[PDB]
Amino acid sequence: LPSRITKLIKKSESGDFASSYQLYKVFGSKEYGVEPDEKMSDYFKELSAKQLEGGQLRVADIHLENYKGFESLIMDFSMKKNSTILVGNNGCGKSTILDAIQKGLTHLSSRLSTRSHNGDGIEKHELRKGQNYASIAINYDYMGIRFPMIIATTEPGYEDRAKSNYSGINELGSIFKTAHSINPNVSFPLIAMYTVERANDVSTRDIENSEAQIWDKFKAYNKSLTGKADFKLFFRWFKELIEIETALRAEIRAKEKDLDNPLLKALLAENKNSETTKKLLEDHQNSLKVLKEKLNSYYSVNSKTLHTVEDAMYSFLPGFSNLKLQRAPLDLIVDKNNVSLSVLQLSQGEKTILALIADIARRLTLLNPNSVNPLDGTGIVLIDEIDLHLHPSWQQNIIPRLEKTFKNIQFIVTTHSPQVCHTIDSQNIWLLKNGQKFKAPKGVRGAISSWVLENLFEVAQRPPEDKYTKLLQEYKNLVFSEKYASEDARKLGATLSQHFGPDDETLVELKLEIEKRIWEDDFEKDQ
Amino acid sequence: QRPPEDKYTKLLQEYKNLVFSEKYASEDARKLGATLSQHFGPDDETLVELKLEIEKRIWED
Amino acid sequence: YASIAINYDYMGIRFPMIIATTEPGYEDRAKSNYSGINELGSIFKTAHSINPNVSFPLIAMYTVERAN
Amino acid sequence: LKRINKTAEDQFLINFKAQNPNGTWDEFRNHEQGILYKRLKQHICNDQMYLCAYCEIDLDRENEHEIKVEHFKSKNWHLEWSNLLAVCLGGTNTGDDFELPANLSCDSYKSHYEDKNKINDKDWTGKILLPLTLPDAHNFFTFEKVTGKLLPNESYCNTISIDGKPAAETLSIVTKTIEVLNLNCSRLNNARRKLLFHFNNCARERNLRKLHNLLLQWNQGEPKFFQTTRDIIIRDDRICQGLLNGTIRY
Numbered sequence: 001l002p003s004r005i006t007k008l009i010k011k012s013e014s015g016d017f018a019s020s021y022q023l024y025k026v027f028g029s030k031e032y033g034v035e036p037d038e039k040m041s042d043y044f045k046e047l048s049a050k051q052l053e054g055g056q057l058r059v060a061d062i063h064l065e066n067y068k069g070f071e072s073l074i075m076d077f078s079m080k081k082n083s084t085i086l087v088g089n090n091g092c093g094k095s096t097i098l099d100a101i102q103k104g105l106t107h108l109s110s111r112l113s114t115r116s117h118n119g120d121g122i123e124k125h126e127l128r129k130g131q132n133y134a135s136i137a138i139n140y141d142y143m144g145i146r147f148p149m150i151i152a153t154t155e156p157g158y159e160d161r162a163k164s165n166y167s168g169i170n171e172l173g174s175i176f177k178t179a180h181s182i183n184p185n186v187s188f189p190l191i192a193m194y195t196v197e198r199a200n201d202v203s204t205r206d207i208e209n210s211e212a213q214i215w216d217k218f219k220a221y222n223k224s225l226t227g228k229a230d231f232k233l234f235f236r237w238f239k240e241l242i243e244i245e246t247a248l249r250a251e252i253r254a255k256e257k258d259l260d261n262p263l264l265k266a267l268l269a270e271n272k273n274s275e276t277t278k279k280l281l282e283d284h285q286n287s288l289k290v291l292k293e294k295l296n297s298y299y300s301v302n303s304k305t306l307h308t309v310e311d312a313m314y315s316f317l318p319g320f321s322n323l324k325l326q327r328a329p330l331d332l333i334v335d336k337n338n339v340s341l342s343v344l345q346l347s348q349g350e351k352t353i354l355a356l357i358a359d360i361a362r363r364l365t366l367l368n369p370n371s372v373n374p375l376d377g378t379g380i381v382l383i384d385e386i387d388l389h390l391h392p393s394w395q396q397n398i399i400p401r402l403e404k405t406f407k408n409i410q411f412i413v414t415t416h417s418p419q420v421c422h423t424i425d426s427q428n429i430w431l432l433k434n435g436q437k438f439k440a441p442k443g444v445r446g447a448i449s450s451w452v453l454e455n456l457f458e459v460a461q462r463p464p465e466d467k468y469t470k471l472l473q474e475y476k477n478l479v480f481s482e483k484y485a486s487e488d489a490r491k492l493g494a495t496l497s498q499h500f501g502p503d504d505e506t507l508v509e510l511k512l513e514i515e516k517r518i519w520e521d522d523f524e525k526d527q
Numbered sequence: 528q529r530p531p532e533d534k535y536t537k538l539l540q541e542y543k544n545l546v547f548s549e550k551y552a553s554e555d556a557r558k559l560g561a562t563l564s565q566h567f568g569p570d571d572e573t574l575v576e577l578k579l580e581i582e583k584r585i586w587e588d
Numbered sequence: 589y590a591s592i593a594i595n596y597d598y599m600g601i602r603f604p605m606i607i608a609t610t611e612p613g614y615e616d617r618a619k620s621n622y623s624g625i626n627e628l629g630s631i632f633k634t635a636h637s638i639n640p641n642v643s644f645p646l647i648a649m650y651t652v653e654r655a656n
Numbered sequence: 657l658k659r660i661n662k663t664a665e666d667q668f669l670i671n672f673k674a675q676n677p678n679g680t681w682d683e684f685r686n687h688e689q690g691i692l693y694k695r696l697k698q699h700i701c702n703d704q705m706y707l708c709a710y711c712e713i714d715l716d717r718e719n720e721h722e723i724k725v726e727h728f729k730s731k732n733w734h735l736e737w738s739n740l741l742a743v744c745l746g747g748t749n750t751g752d753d754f755e756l757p758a759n760l761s762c763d764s765y766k767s768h769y770e771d772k773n774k775i776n777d778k779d780w781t782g783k784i785l786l787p788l789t790l791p792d793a794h795n796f797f798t799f800e801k802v803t804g805k806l807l808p809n810e811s812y813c814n815t816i817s818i819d820g821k822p823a824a825e826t827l828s829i830v831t832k833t834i835e836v837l838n839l840n841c842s843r844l845n846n847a848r849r850k851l852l853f854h855f856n857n858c859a860r861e862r863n864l865r866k867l868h869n870l871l872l873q874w875n876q877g878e879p880k881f882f883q884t885t886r887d888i889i890i891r892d893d894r895i896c897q898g899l900l901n902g903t904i905r906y
């Protein structure tokens with residue numbers, strides 16, 4: 001064995017998964033003239049299974065051929081920075097790349113927490129119209145090692161070189177499986193893709209259906225790469241966690257049956273003038289209120305490790321506190337500016353952000369069983385149309401806080417607004433042109449939104465159709481056309497000064513130019 | 528218009544106020560000038576304005 | 589108590605409306621009234637009766653649920 | 657193009673020329689840790705007064721990573737003195753080559769246009785203006801005050817010859833120069849517009865003393881960035897000409 005092998009072994013002894021897997025590959029082949037011995041390969045695999053403190057699993061590159069509407073879109077997602085903004089246009093193919101990654105990622109999600117090998121391939125409506133050689137190839141990247149994977153399809157009447165491999169991800173699944181059964185507390189990779197279908201978020205259909213499972217690690221992968229932030233699962237987790245802490249419930253059952261008897265209704269209808277009975281009815285309603293208040297007071301006292309998850313959703317929505325539910329007819333209660341109110345009546349964007357953050361936090365806490373800081377895990381989260389229901393105040397803040405609350409999470413997202421796409425550095429935002437990928441020009445990390453719109457989205461800051469815009473254009477043409485006072489500059493100035501106002505940094509400059517021109521015709525009189 | 532909490536935006540503000548005040552050409556003027564010229568490009572709106580005015584009021588001195 | 593009032597306009601002639609509710613523990617202090625919308629419906633129905641091809645207004649809202 | 661004054665030939669360039677008569681620019685840059693490379697870069701930039709060749713932007717005094725060296729003829733031209741020039745970054749160096757066109761300014765747009773046009777003849781001499789051969793005072797590029805886009809002047813082009821070519825086609829050469837070097841991008845147009853802004857601002861008071869101060873500050877002293885725009889503004893304005901020739905006194 002060469003001294004390089006000994007150096008690699010020594011490096012791997014000091015907690016280095018990269019060296020362990022390199023020696024595994026060397027033992028599995030004839031690299032560096034090393035004799036093939038599966039025994040030392042198994043020993044190296046066992047050593048590597050104990051070295052998975054965290055690798056920040058990414059997606060690195062992507063290779064698409066004749067998929068959706070693209071022909072060849074080799075793209076390199078960022079590795080040193082945990083963000084990527086896919087800007088594109090409406091109809092250029094933003095969701096194409098994200099959909100390709102989620103079809104690739106379903107196989108990975110299966111091979112983490114399932115058995116067997118199940119995954120989805122290219123369907124009939126996904127193949128490009130004209131050719132049949134479709135293939136998705138996403139090269140994953142663990143801490144120092146890469147696993148190829150190609151998803152391919154071929155029409156029955158032809159045979160292209162679309163040989164689907166699935167060669168690499170099997171090794172990743174195997175190493176995670178081996179590492180799981182030595183210490184049942186491991187930081188499993190997170191997988192989640194979130195479409196625009198989260199708009200139909202929290203509603204009565206989930207809360208009212210509340211009326212068990214121990215929340216194992218292999219759960220949170222379930223129903224993750226679907227495209228909706230299911231509040232029903234979060235509500236069930238909330239109930240299950242807080243139930244860890246009957247006569248009143250039995251009393252509620254008995255009082256409901258007694259007060260709803262048909263005989264009581266008939267007696268009430270027979271004698272409308274029942275003030276003496278009305279007093280007893282109001283006493284019963286007071287007992288109702290007292291019992292419900294006591295049952296709810298048996299709740300809003302203490303909490304558990306759920307507090308860390310709760311702190312994640314109070315940061316994205318300022319002015320929100322005291323999130324509990326009600327042991328009366330089921331509902332979830334927030335407090336907004338000292339106004340306690342139900343979750344079902346929150347704003348659309350507020351509910352969207354709440355459901356999104358709650359779902360991600362639930363996933364992160366279920367994957368990480370025992371950690372001092374469960375909320376900063378390793379995984380991949382995909383968001384489609386992040387600016388769907390958000391005010392511009394939250395648009396320039398959504399991502400910088402998202403990268404801070406969740407640290408080691410990749411956030412490949414698609415945007416449709418300049419405000420959100422000017423908080424990310426220019427080298428990590430991708431523009432999809434008609435058919436090719438282009439990089440943004442320098443000066444986006446802290447530039448003005450107008451500049452971003454003008455040189456990243458190809459849109460004028462002034463609508464090039466309105467009457468007032470055309471009038472301003474004619475005015476700016478006339479001021480510099482050697483006739484600064486030929487009665488039409490006068491008319492248009494009298495119009496625009498009254499419209500925009502005498503104090504705006506578009507007409508103040510041009511009026512200053514007019515004043516300079518007025519001065520220029522004073523000393524020339526003697527000439 | 529610009530980010531309310533961004534490191535480069537804070538550098539822009541810390542450059543602009545020093546341009547319009549003491550320390551027009553000192554310890555930090557050149558270094559922030561170079562840092563904000565590497566990004567945003569060396570040819571934009573705000574920085575050319577600031578450079579022109581610093582040239583004007585260093586010529587006056 | 590809550591109350592919503594809307595005034596509908598047609599050719600400079602206006603139709604009143606008010607829709608209200610009261611919690612069932614206190615005597616209602618705002619009763620519903622639909623005086624003008626019955627008027628408008630009757631006018632349009634009579635116009636249809638005399639002539640089957642009289643143009644009618646369009647009423648519709650498109651909620652965010654049109655995403656899917 | 658403000659035009660530069662090519663100084664006398666330096667010694668270490670000749671020393672590197674002697675050792676390898678057939679060598680590339682990368683060979684000169686890599687050899688001896690690039691000490692001679694940055695020495696030659698400093699020589700060329702000091703000759704040029706730290707202003708961009710075709711783009712006219714304030715090249716950084718301290719950091720030398722913001723300055724690139726390119727050749728008028730596409731890259732033995734790699735060693736000839738009549739080919740080396742110093743240019744701006746062009747908006748690149750954040751990426752490598754996968755950047756949106758129609759925004760690049762100085763030289764990276766030149767390479768992009770060369771590749772997408774498939775121009776076999778890399779000798780741009782006689783096709784676009786060469787800063788070395790330009791006269792000290794040239795009218796040429798005029799610009800409208802609306803958008804700030806520099807445009808050729810037919811009157812002055814029709815009465816001068818450039819690059820050993822007939823004077824009839826000089827206007828075509830200037831238009832080709834504009835097209836290849838992309839001298840009408842948004843950033844440079846905005847810079848010219850704000851140069852006009854700062855020329856106009858001091859003129860509100862009509863204080864001829866401060867106006868003469870502006871003329872002395874621009875025309876005299878070491879040349880500054882966008883020198884062509886300053887010259888065009890000064891010549892175009894009648895009162896500036898009257899102040900320069902002594903018609904107006906304060």
Ligand SMILES: Nc1ncnc2c1ncn2[C@@H]1O[C@H](COP(=O)(O)OP(=O)(O)O)[C@@H](O)[C@H]1O
Pocket residue numbers: 068069070089090091092093094095096125126127128129
């Ligand atoms: N069989 C096909 N052939 C060619 N193009 C297709 C085919 N199927 C889908 N597409 C393309 O898919 C595009 C849909 O865009 P999409 O990926 O949803 O991104 P976004 O919704 O952000 O605009 C369309 O522009 C369409 O041209």
